[PDB]
């Protein structure tokens, strides 16, 4: 089953990368961020055979996932909540370098310590899953509120899609960071170590890593294939 996901990830990810990269003109901010995410997930799925330098690139891609997804949400909030003050393609390459740049800052130790790895885990939990999740929650809650006061036939479908995206992200990311937090507290002295539970926690690491792989493989299906614009390009190319 793991090998199937490997091809599924590359296949779907490549289509997203190819469709957007074949555009002959400028790409909107949402389009630019989606392209970065497709590349980010593309690298991670390449790791599958080995995991099932490798670790270092693994971390970079994982954070790229949430942060890029976090970046997508903020632009949607800006475009849909304050649509009157932001009427106008705005280049956003600056932030993409930062998000990829912030992964580099954290990714150095992987190429290169008890306290060092403790700080690594602390930063990972603080700024990799928690803050992005809060950002997504706030932005999409305001988007839902604005749409509920809107008028049209697309509002309901937009609400459904937003809820689906948020729920999928939560249910696919929480199980890994929960185990990471449990292990963090165990190391800090808030819990007790035992032979069986350590192996169970390693298996939990494995299972939640597979779940994250599933999310990375599903990213094309929930952010690209559901949009009207993307399908038109796919039908064109």
Author numbering: 59 to 110, 126 to 161, 165 to 188, 208 to 332
Paper text:
Chemokine receptors belong to the superfamily of G-protein-coupled receptors (GPCRs) with primary coupling to the Gαi subtype of heterotrimeric G-proteins and β-arrestins (βarrs). In this context, CXCR3 and CXCR7 constitute an interesting receptor pair, wherein CXCR3 couples to both G-proteins and βarrs while CXCR7 lacks any measurable G-protein activation but robustly recruits βarrs upon agonist-stimulation. Here, we determine cryo-EM structures of CXCR3 in an Apo-state and in complex with small molecule agonists biased toward G-proteins or βarrs.
In addition, we also purified CXCR3 in the presence of CXCL10 and reconstituted its complex with G-protein followed by cryo-EM structure determination at 3.3 Å. However, some of the regions of the receptor such as the ECL1, ECL2, and extracellular portions of TM1-3 in the Apo-state, and the extracellular region of TM1 in the VUF11418-bound structure were not resolved well. A comparison of the Apo-state CXCR3 structure with the inactive state and VUF-bound structures reveals that Phe1824.56 in the Apo-state undergoes a rotation of 135° and points toward the ligand binding pocket, and this rotameric conformation is stabilized by Asn1323.33 and Gln2195.42. In addition, Gln2195.42 makes an ionic contact with Tyr2716.51 and further locks the receptor in the active-like conformation. However, it is not possible to discern at this point whether these features represent receptor activation due to constitutive activity or reflect the stabilization of an active conformation by CXCL10, which has subsequently dissociated from the receptor. Still, there are clear differences in the orthosteric binding pocket, in terms of the positioning of the extracellular side of the transmembrane helices and the conformation of CXCL10-interacting residues. In addition, the side chains of several CXCL10-interacting residues are not well resolved in the Apo-CXCR3 structure, which further corroborates our interpretation regarding the absence of CXCL10 in the orthosteric binding pocket.
